[PDB]
Amino acid sequence: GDTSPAQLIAGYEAAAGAPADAERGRALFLSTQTGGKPDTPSCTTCHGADVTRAGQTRTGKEIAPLAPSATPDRFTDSARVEKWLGRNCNSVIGRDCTPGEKADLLAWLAAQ
Ligand code: HEC
């Protein structure tokens, strides 16, 4: 694509002022949130708790696995990551994800 997962994570770490922490990324992705849309309390509502399996939209359509081990071009287009993170953080959390959250989330997801 136009980027690598490491290049994306390093740009988020620079904006955040801190290195990514995949354990925090895992905890945020599995969390149940209350500030966003009622029908999407968690990242897992659509992607599932195991991101090597397929997920499902709110209507039951299949979502390719988020893990790069299952779907190889994941996180290789910088615009695409920002587009989905913008929409999906707002639906789940109710706000944009910060650059520190984005680094943590992608550091966890990039290793799956
Ligand atoms: C359903 C309403 C979703 C919820 C809740 C979350 N995501 Fe998701 N995400 C969804 C779709 C339909 C898609 C696009 C289809 C595809 O196969 O890519 C995505 C995509 C992403 C991406 C982009 C991956 C890439 O190819 O670079 C990321 C980084 C992502 N989703 C992460 C993510 C997080 C962190 C979420 C909780 C805040 C989350 N998603 C929720 C559908 C839905």
Side-chain angles (χ1 to χ4, degrees), residues 1-22 24-33 35-36 38-52 54-112:
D2 51 57
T3 194
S4 65
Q7 287 181 269
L8 291 174
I9 298 156
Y12 291 128
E13 290 173 330
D21 177 341
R24 287 197 298 272
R26 193 197 71 100
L28 183 54
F29 194 91
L30 304 179
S31 70
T32 295
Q33 292 286 323
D39 56 310
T40 58
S42 171
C43 304
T44 61
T45 300
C46 301
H47 301 291
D50 178 356
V51 298
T52 67
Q56 54 300 299
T57 57
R58 294 277 66 195
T59 260
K61 313 271 182 182
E62 186 180 320
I63 304 171
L66 249 194
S69 61
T71 136
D73 51 329
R74 289 289 181 203
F75 322 127
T76 58
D77 174 322
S78 46
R80 192 167 259 171
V81 164
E82 274 291 307
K83 175 179 157 171
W84 289 108
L85 285 173
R87 178 170 211 108
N88 292 328
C89 293
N90 280 100
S91 311
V92 178
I93 308 171
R95 46 164 181 84
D96 294 323
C97 276
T98 67
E101 290 164 336
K102 290 180 184 168
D104 295 348
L105 284 159
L106 296 176
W108 178 70
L109 288 168
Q112 308 304 128

